[PDB]
Design a protein around this ligand. Structure first.
Ligand SMILES: Nc1nc2c(ncn2[C@H]2C[C@H](O)[C@@H](COP(=O)(O)OP(=O)(O)[C@H](F)P(=O)(O)O)O2)c(=O)[nH]1
Ligand SMILES: [Cl-]
Ligand SMILES: [Cl-]
Ligand SMILES: [Cl-]
Ligand SMILES: [Mg+2]
Ligand SMILES: [Mg+2]
Ligand code: NA
Ligand code: NA
Ligand code: NA
Length: 326
DNA sequence: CCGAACAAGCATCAGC
DNA sequence: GCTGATGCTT
DNA sequence: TTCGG
Protein backbone atom coordinates (compact mmCIF):
# COMPACT_ATOMS: atom_id res chain seq x y z
CA UNK A 1 0.00 0.00 0.00
CA UNK A 2 2.90 2.23 -0.98
CA UNK A 3 0.44 4.33 -2.97
CA UNK A 4 -2.81 3.46 -1.21
CA UNK A 5 -4.01 7.05 -1.05
CA UNK A 6 -3.69 7.40 -4.83
CA UNK A 7 -5.28 4.02 -5.54
CA UNK A 8 -8.17 4.75 -3.15
CA UNK A 9 -8.79 8.06 -4.93
CA UNK A 10 -8.83 6.38 -8.34
CA UNK A 11 -11.14 3.62 -7.12
CA UNK A 12 -13.52 6.24 -5.73
CA UNK A 13 -13.52 7.98 -9.11
CA UNK A 14 -14.11 4.66 -10.89
CA UNK A 15 -17.13 3.99 -8.68
CA UNK A 16 -18.49 7.50 -9.32
CA UNK A 17 -18.21 7.08 -13.09
CA UNK A 18 -19.80 3.62 -13.03
CA UNK A 19 -22.59 4.25 -10.54
CA UNK A 20 -23.45 7.92 -11.13
CA UNK A 21 -22.20 8.99 -14.56
CA UNK A 22 -22.86 5.56 -16.10
CA UNK A 23 -19.60 6.06 -18.02
CA UNK A 24 -18.25 2.51 -18.33
CA UNK A 25 -15.05 3.41 -20.17
CA UNK A 26 -14.05 6.01 -17.58
CA UNK A 27 -14.76 3.39 -14.91
CA UNK A 28 -12.47 0.90 -16.65
CA UNK A 29 -9.79 3.56 -17.14
CA UNK A 30 -9.72 4.49 -13.46
CA UNK A 31 -9.67 0.85 -12.29
CA UNK A 32 -6.85 -0.01 -14.71
CA UNK A 33 -4.79 2.94 -13.47
CA UNK A 34 -5.44 2.00 -9.85
CA UNK A 35 -4.33 -1.56 -10.61
CA UNK A 36 -1.12 -0.61 -12.39
CA UNK A 37 -0.27 1.86 -9.63
CA UNK A 38 -1.02 -0.72 -6.93
CA UNK A 39 1.68 -3.02 -8.39
CA UNK A 40 4.23 -0.20 -8.87
CA UNK A 41 7.04 -0.88 -6.34
CA UNK A 42 7.94 2.76 -5.62
CA UNK A 43 6.17 5.44 -3.62
CA UNK A 44 5.02 7.79 -6.40
CA UNK A 45 6.47 11.30 -6.23
CA UNK A 46 4.65 13.06 -9.10
CA UNK A 47 1.95 12.69 -11.71
CA UNK A 48 4.68 12.67 -14.37
CA UNK A 49 6.26 9.60 -12.76
CA UNK A 50 2.84 7.95 -12.71
CA UNK A 51 2.12 8.84 -16.35
CA UNK A 52 4.95 6.54 -17.46
CA UNK A 53 2.77 3.58 -16.43
CA UNK A 54 0.36 2.14 -19.03
CA UNK A 55 -3.17 3.19 -18.19
CA UNK A 56 -2.16 6.47 -16.53
CA UNK A 57 -2.73 9.39 -18.89
CA UNK A 58 -2.75 13.17 -18.73
CA UNK A 59 -5.95 13.57 -16.70
CA UNK A 60 -5.05 11.03 -14.01
CA UNK A 61 -1.52 12.42 -13.75
CA UNK A 62 -3.00 15.86 -13.01
CA UNK A 63 -5.22 14.40 -10.29
CA UNK A 64 -2.23 12.58 -8.80
CA UNK A 65 -0.37 15.91 -8.67
CA UNK A 66 -3.31 17.53 -6.85
CA UNK A 67 -3.54 14.60 -4.41
CA UNK A 68 0.19 14.56 -3.62
CA UNK A 69 0.21 18.32 -3.08
CA UNK A 70 -2.90 18.53 -0.88
CA UNK A 71 -3.86 15.03 0.28
CA UNK A 72 -7.29 15.32 -1.37
CA UNK A 73 -9.09 15.90 -4.67
CA UNK A 74 -11.55 18.80 -5.01
CA UNK A 75 -13.54 16.81 -7.59
CA UNK A 76 -14.17 14.07 -5.02
CA UNK A 77 -14.77 16.53 -2.17
CA UNK A 78 -17.60 17.96 -4.28
CA UNK A 79 -18.98 14.54 -5.29
CA UNK A 80 -19.11 13.51 -1.63
CA UNK A 81 -21.28 16.59 -0.92
CA UNK A 82 -23.73 15.82 -3.74
CA UNK A 83 -26.89 14.23 -2.31
CA UNK A 84 -28.00 12.51 -5.51
CA UNK A 85 -24.51 11.09 -6.02
CA UNK A 86 -24.37 10.03 -2.36
CA UNK A 87 -27.77 8.32 -2.59
CA UNK A 88 -26.94 6.52 -5.84
CA UNK A 89 -23.58 5.33 -4.54
CA UNK A 90 -25.22 3.94 -1.40
CA UNK A 91 -28.05 2.13 -3.21
CA UNK A 92 -25.68 0.40 -5.65
CA UNK A 93 -24.00 -1.27 -2.67
CA UNK A 94 -27.03 -3.59 -2.54
CA UNK A 95 -26.47 -6.68 -4.68
CA UNK A 96 -28.89 -6.53 -7.62
CA UNK A 97 -29.20 -2.72 -7.54
CA UNK A 98 -27.11 -1.21 -10.33
CA UNK A 99 -26.78 2.35 -11.64
CA UNK A 100 -30.13 2.34 -13.43
CA UNK A 101 -32.26 0.98 -10.58
CA UNK A 102 -30.46 3.16 -8.04
CA UNK A 103 -31.35 6.33 -9.95
CA UNK A 104 -34.92 5.07 -10.40
CA UNK A 105 -35.27 4.36 -6.67
CA UNK A 106 -34.04 7.90 -5.90
CA UNK A 107 -36.64 9.32 -8.32
CA UNK A 108 -39.28 7.44 -6.32
CA UNK A 109 -38.03 8.70 -2.97
CA UNK A 110 -36.25 5.48 -1.99
CA UNK A 111 -32.73 6.44 -0.95
CA UNK A 112 -31.84 4.99 2.48
CA UNK A 113 -31.56 1.57 4.08
CA UNK A 114 -34.79 2.36 5.96
CA UNK A 115 -36.55 3.26 2.70
CA UNK A 116 -35.47 -0.02 1.14
CA UNK A 117 -36.58 -2.07 4.14
CA UNK A 118 -40.09 -0.59 4.06
CA UNK A 119 -40.34 -1.11 0.28
CA UNK A 120 -39.30 -4.76 -0.09
CA UNK A 121 -42.27 -5.27 -2.40
CA UNK A 122 -40.63 -2.88 -4.89
CA UNK A 123 -37.50 -5.08 -5.12
CA UNK A 124 -36.97 -8.05 -7.37
CA UNK A 125 -35.81 -11.32 -5.82
CA UNK A 126 -32.08 -10.67 -6.18
CA UNK A 127 -32.37 -7.18 -4.70
CA UNK A 128 -34.49 -8.43 -1.80
CA UNK A 129 -31.84 -10.99 -0.78
CA UNK A 130 -29.13 -8.36 -1.31
CA UNK A 131 -30.97 -6.11 1.14
CA UNK A 132 -31.52 -8.96 3.64
CA UNK A 133 -27.76 -9.54 3.85
CA UNK A 134 -26.54 -5.98 3.15
CA UNK A 135 -24.22 -5.88 6.16
CA UNK A 136 -22.94 -9.45 5.79
CA UNK A 137 -22.00 -9.07 2.13
CA UNK A 138 -19.62 -6.20 2.87
CA UNK A 139 -17.65 -8.32 5.36
CA UNK A 140 -14.51 -10.13 4.24
CA UNK A 141 -14.02 -13.90 4.61
CA UNK A 142 -10.85 -15.04 6.42
CA UNK A 143 -8.98 -17.70 4.48
CA UNK A 144 -9.44 -19.94 7.54
CA UNK A 145 -13.19 -19.73 6.95
CA UNK A 146 -12.69 -20.22 3.20
CA UNK A 147 -10.91 -23.49 3.99
CA UNK A 148 -13.82 -24.72 6.12
CA UNK A 149 -16.23 -23.77 3.33
CA UNK A 150 -14.05 -25.53 0.74
CA UNK A 151 -14.11 -28.69 2.83
CA UNK A 152 -17.92 -28.65 3.03
CA UNK A 153 -18.45 -27.96 -0.68
CA UNK A 154 -15.93 -30.55 -1.86
CA UNK A 155 -17.20 -33.24 0.50
CA UNK A 156 -20.87 -32.59 -0.26
CA UNK A 157 -20.22 -32.61 -4.01
CA UNK A 158 -18.42 -35.96 -3.58
CA UNK A 159 -21.49 -37.45 -1.87
CA UNK A 160 -23.71 -36.54 -4.84
CA UNK A 161 -21.31 -38.10 -7.37
CA UNK A 162 -17.65 -39.02 -6.93
CA UNK A 163 -16.97 -37.99 -10.55
CA UNK A 164 -17.64 -34.29 -9.92
CA UNK A 165 -14.59 -32.12 -9.43
CA UNK A 166 -15.13 -28.85 -7.58
CA UNK A 167 -12.34 -26.26 -7.58
CA UNK A 168 -12.38 -23.09 -5.48
CA UNK A 169 -11.19 -20.21 -7.63
CA UNK A 170 -11.36 -16.46 -7.24
CA UNK A 171 -8.98 -14.70 -4.87
CA UNK A 172 -8.81 -17.92 -2.83
CA UNK A 173 -6.97 -19.75 -5.61
CA UNK A 174 -4.71 -16.69 -5.96
CA UNK A 175 -3.64 -17.34 -2.35
CA UNK A 176 -5.34 -14.32 -0.76
CA UNK A 177 -5.51 -14.23 3.05
CA UNK A 178 -9.14 -13.12 2.77
CA UNK A 179 -11.83 -13.21 0.09
CA UNK A 180 -15.00 -11.26 -0.65
CA UNK A 181 -17.00 -14.40 -1.55
CA UNK A 182 -16.55 -18.04 -2.63
CA UNK A 183 -16.20 -18.98 -6.31
CA UNK A 184 -16.55 -22.67 -7.18
CA UNK A 185 -15.75 -24.17 -10.58
CA UNK A 186 -17.55 -27.46 -11.17
CA UNK A 187 -17.02 -30.21 -13.75
CA UNK A 188 -18.54 -33.61 -14.41
CA UNK A 189 -17.56 -36.01 -17.23
CA UNK A 190 -21.20 -36.16 -18.38
CA UNK A 191 -20.98 -32.50 -19.47
CA UNK A 192 -18.48 -31.75 -22.25
CA UNK A 193 -18.39 -29.35 -25.18
CA UNK A 194 -19.70 -32.21 -27.32
CA UNK A 195 -22.66 -33.48 -25.30
CA UNK A 196 -24.67 -33.30 -22.11
CA UNK A 197 -25.34 -36.88 -21.04
CA UNK A 198 -27.05 -36.14 -17.69
CA UNK A 199 -29.55 -33.41 -16.79
CA UNK A 200 -29.63 -31.38 -13.57
CA UNK A 201 -25.86 -31.63 -13.01
CA UNK A 202 -25.71 -28.20 -11.34
CA UNK A 203 -29.15 -28.51 -9.72
CA UNK A 204 -28.22 -31.73 -7.89
CA UNK A 205 -25.20 -30.07 -6.30
CA UNK A 206 -27.16 -26.95 -5.30
CA UNK A 207 -29.87 -29.22 -3.85
CA UNK A 208 -27.35 -31.18 -1.76
CA UNK A 209 -25.81 -27.98 -0.37
CA UNK A 210 -29.29 -26.69 0.48
CA UNK A 211 -30.14 -30.01 2.14
CA UNK A 212 -27.22 -29.65 4.62
CA UNK A 213 -28.16 -25.98 5.12
CA UNK A 214 -24.95 -24.66 3.56
CA UNK A 215 -26.73 -22.82 0.74
CA UNK A 216 -29.37 -20.58 2.34
CA UNK A 217 -30.64 -18.37 -0.51
CA UNK A 218 -30.60 -18.14 -4.32
CA UNK A 219 -29.97 -14.95 -6.28
CA UNK A 220 -30.11 -16.55 -9.73
CA UNK A 221 -29.83 -20.06 -11.08
CA UNK A 222 -29.60 -21.67 -14.48
CA UNK A 223 -28.15 -24.79 -16.09
CA UNK A 224 -24.53 -23.65 -15.74
CA UNK A 225 -24.38 -20.72 -13.27
CA UNK A 226 -25.67 -20.48 -9.69
CA UNK A 227 -25.39 -17.23 -7.70
CA UNK A 228 -26.47 -17.48 -4.12
CA UNK A 229 -25.85 -17.30 -0.40
CA UNK A 230 -24.21 -19.72 2.01
CA UNK A 231 -23.31 -19.93 5.69
CA UNK A 232 -20.88 -21.96 7.76
CA UNK A 233 -22.41 -23.94 10.64
CA UNK A 234 -21.75 -22.57 14.10
CA UNK A 235 -21.22 -24.55 17.29
CA UNK A 236 -23.33 -24.56 20.46
CA UNK A 237 -23.83 -21.12 22.07
CA UNK A 238 -21.61 -19.61 19.33
CA UNK A 239 -22.71 -16.53 17.43
CA UNK A 240 -23.48 -17.44 13.86
CA UNK A 241 -21.11 -16.74 10.99
CA UNK A 242 -22.06 -14.01 8.51
CA UNK A 243 -23.90 -15.13 5.41
CA UNK A 244 -21.59 -15.22 2.37
CA UNK A 245 -22.00 -14.90 -1.38
CA UNK A 246 -21.28 -18.10 -3.33
CA UNK A 247 -21.01 -18.48 -7.10
CA UNK A 248 -20.90 -21.91 -8.74
CA UNK A 249 -20.03 -22.31 -12.43
CA UNK A 250 -20.39 -25.64 -14.22
CA UNK A 251 -17.97 -25.74 -17.16
CA UNK A 252 -17.57 -28.42 -19.87
CA UNK A 253 -15.02 -30.86 -18.51
CA UNK A 254 -12.82 -30.71 -21.61
CA UNK A 255 -12.72 -26.89 -21.22
CA UNK A 256 -11.47 -26.87 -17.62
CA UNK A 257 -8.27 -24.87 -18.26
CA UNK A 258 -10.01 -21.96 -20.00
CA UNK A 259 -12.65 -22.13 -17.28
CA UNK A 260 -10.21 -22.14 -14.38
CA UNK A 261 -8.19 -19.32 -15.97
CA UNK A 262 -11.38 -17.27 -16.25
CA UNK A 263 -12.67 -18.08 -12.76
CA UNK A 264 -9.29 -17.48 -11.07
CA UNK A 265 -9.09 -13.91 -12.39
CA UNK A 266 -8.66 -11.27 -11.16
CA UNK A 267 -11.27 -9.44 -13.22
CA UNK A 268 -8.72 -6.81 -14.29
CA UNK A 269 -6.18 -9.56 -15.00
CA UNK A 270 -8.70 -11.22 -17.34
CA UNK A 271 -9.50 -7.93 -19.11
CA UNK A 272 -5.80 -7.22 -19.59
CA UNK A 273 -5.11 -10.78 -20.77
CA UNK A 274 -8.08 -10.80 -23.15
CA UNK A 275 -7.13 -7.37 -24.49
CA UNK A 276 -3.61 -8.66 -25.14
CA UNK A 277 -5.07 -11.75 -26.83
CA UNK A 278 -6.97 -9.52 -29.27
CA UNK A 279 -3.80 -7.58 -30.08
CA UNK A 280 -2.13 -10.95 -30.76
CA UNK A 281 -4.96 -12.12 -33.02
CA UNK A 282 -6.88 -14.36 -30.60
CA UNK A 283 -10.03 -14.18 -28.51
CA UNK A 284 -10.27 -15.82 -25.07
CA UNK A 285 -13.42 -16.68 -23.16
CA UNK A 286 -14.09 -19.15 -20.33
CA UNK A 287 -14.46 -22.00 -22.87
CA UNK A 288 -11.82 -21.60 -25.58
CA UNK A 289 -9.09 -19.57 -27.18
CA UNK A 290 -9.63 -19.12 -30.91
CA UNK A 291 -7.68 -17.26 -33.60
CA UNK A 292 -9.14 -14.22 -35.27
CA UNK A 293 -9.33 -14.63 -39.04
CA UNK A 294 -8.55 -12.08 -41.73
CA UNK A 295 -11.84 -10.26 -41.11
CA UNK A 296 -11.88 -10.56 -37.32
CA UNK A 297 -14.20 -13.58 -37.10
CA UNK A 298 -13.17 -16.13 -34.48
CA UNK A 299 -11.95 -19.39 -35.97
CA UNK A 300 -12.05 -22.87 -34.46
CA UNK A 301 -10.93 -23.59 -30.88
CA UNK A 302 -7.24 -24.20 -30.43
CA UNK A 303 -5.94 -27.21 -28.45
CA UNK A 304 -5.44 -26.41 -24.76
CA UNK A 305 -3.84 -28.84 -22.31
CA UNK A 306 -2.86 -26.54 -19.43
CA UNK A 307 -3.35 -23.00 -18.24
CA UNK A 308 0.15 -22.31 -19.59
CA UNK A 309 -0.86 -23.26 -23.14
CA UNK A 310 -3.17 -20.23 -23.15
CA UNK A 311 -0.37 -17.88 -22.06
CA UNK A 312 1.89 -19.45 -24.72
CA UNK A 313 -0.54 -18.70 -27.58
CA UNK A 314 -0.52 -14.98 -26.73
CA UNK A 315 3.25 -14.93 -26.08
CA UNK A 316 3.00 -14.22 -22.35
CA UNK A 317 5.30 -15.85 -19.83
CA UNK A 318 3.28 -17.98 -17.43
CA UNK A 319 1.92 -16.29 -14.31
CA UNK A 320 0.99 -18.38 -11.29
CA UNK A 321 -2.43 -17.54 -9.79
CA UNK A 322 -0.82 -15.63 -6.91
CA UNK A 323 0.62 -13.21 -9.48
CA UNK A 324 -2.75 -12.45 -11.15
CA UNK A 325 -4.21 -10.24 -8.37
CA UNK A 326 -4.42 -7.15 -10.54
C1' DC B 1 -7.72 12.55 -34.88
C1' DC B 2 -10.64 8.76 -33.63
C1' DG B 3 -12.21 3.95 -33.14
C1' DA B 4 -11.81 0.42 -29.67
C1' DA B 5 -11.87 -0.77 -25.10
C1' DC B 6 -13.23 -8.82 -22.49
C1' DA B 7 -16.70 -11.88 -22.62
C1' DA B 8 -20.85 -13.95 -21.14
C1' DG B 9 -25.02 -16.30 -17.85
C1' DC B 10 -29.46 -15.24 -15.75
C1' DA B 11 -33.43 -12.06 -14.85
C1' DT B 12 -36.47 -8.96 -16.85
C1' DC B 13 -38.93 -6.54 -20.26
C1' DA B 14 -40.81 -4.98 -24.89
C1' DG B 15 -42.46 -6.36 -29.34
C1' DC B 16 -44.75 -9.55 -32.34
C1' DG C 1 -44.38 -18.45 -26.44
C1' DC C 2 -39.97 -16.72 -28.98
C1' DT C 3 -36.51 -13.27 -29.88
C1' DG C 4 -33.58 -9.55 -28.80
C1' DA C 5 -32.22 -5.67 -25.88
C1' DT C 6 -31.10 -4.25 -21.33
C1' DG C 7 -29.55 -4.54 -16.47
C1' DC C 8 -26.66 -6.71 -13.30
C1' DT C 9 -23.48 -9.64 -12.30
C1' DT C 10 -19.14 -13.11 -12.48
C1' DT D 1 -10.03 8.04 -19.75
C1' DT D 2 -6.30 5.91 -22.26
C1' DC D 3 -4.14 3.70 -26.01
C1' DG D 4 -2.62 2.77 -30.70
C1' DG D 5 -2.71 3.35 -35.74
N1 LIG E 1 -13.45 -11.88 -18.02
C1 LIG E 1 -14.00 -11.41 -16.81
N2 LIG E 1 -13.93 -12.19 -15.74
C2 LIG E 1 -14.44 -11.77 -14.59
C3 LIG E 1 -15.05 -10.55 -14.48
N3 LIG E 1 -15.48 -10.40 -13.21
C4 LIG E 1 -15.13 -11.51 -12.55
N4 LIG E 1 -14.52 -12.35 -13.36
C5 LIG E 1 -13.99 -13.62 -13.04
C6 LIG E 1 -12.54 -13.35 -12.42
C7 LIG E 1 -12.80 -13.38 -10.88
O1 LIG E 1 -11.56 -13.70 -10.23
C8 LIG E 1 -13.71 -14.39 -10.76
C9 LIG E 1 -14.51 -14.33 -9.54
O2 LIG E 1 -15.25 -13.10 -9.53
P1 LIG E 1 -15.28 -12.21 -8.15
O3 LIG E 1 -16.11 -10.94 -8.34
O4 LIG E 1 -15.71 -13.10 -6.98
O5 LIG E 1 -13.71 -11.73 -7.98
P2 LIG E 1 -12.53 -12.39 -7.06
O6 LIG E 1 -11.30 -12.41 -7.89
O7 LIG E 1 -12.84 -13.72 -6.45
C10 LIG E 1 -12.29 -11.05 -5.76
F1 LIG E 1 -10.98 -10.89 -5.47
P3 LIG E 1 -13.21 -11.47 -4.21
O8 LIG E 1 -14.49 -12.25 -4.64
O9 LIG E 1 -12.34 -12.23 -3.36
O10 LIG E 1 -13.64 -10.14 -3.58
O11 LIG E 1 -14.69 -14.19 -12.07
C11 LIG E 1 -15.10 -9.77 -15.64
O12 LIG E 1 -15.72 -8.46 -15.57
N5 LIG E 1 -14.57 -10.21 -16.77
CL1 LIG F 1 -17.45 6.26 -20.88
CL1 LIG G 1 -10.14 12.96 -1.69
CL1 LIG H 1 -16.44 -20.70 -27.36
MG1 LIG I 1 -14.70 -14.15 -5.50
MG1 LIG J 1 -6.80 -0.79 -27.42
NA1 NA K 1 0.85 6.13 -19.30
NA1 NA L 1 -25.26 -3.33 -6.52
NA1 NA M 1 -17.88 -14.33 -6.92
Amino acid sequence: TLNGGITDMLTELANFEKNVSQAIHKYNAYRKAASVIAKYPHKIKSGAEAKKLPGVGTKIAEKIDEFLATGKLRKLEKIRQDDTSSSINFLTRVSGIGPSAARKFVDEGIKTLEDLRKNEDKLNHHQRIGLKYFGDFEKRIPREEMLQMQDIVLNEVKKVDSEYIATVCGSFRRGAESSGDMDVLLTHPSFTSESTKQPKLLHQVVEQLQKVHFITDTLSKGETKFMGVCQLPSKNDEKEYPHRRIDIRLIPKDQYYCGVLYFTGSDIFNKNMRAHALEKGFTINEYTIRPLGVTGVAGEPLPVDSEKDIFDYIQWKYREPKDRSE
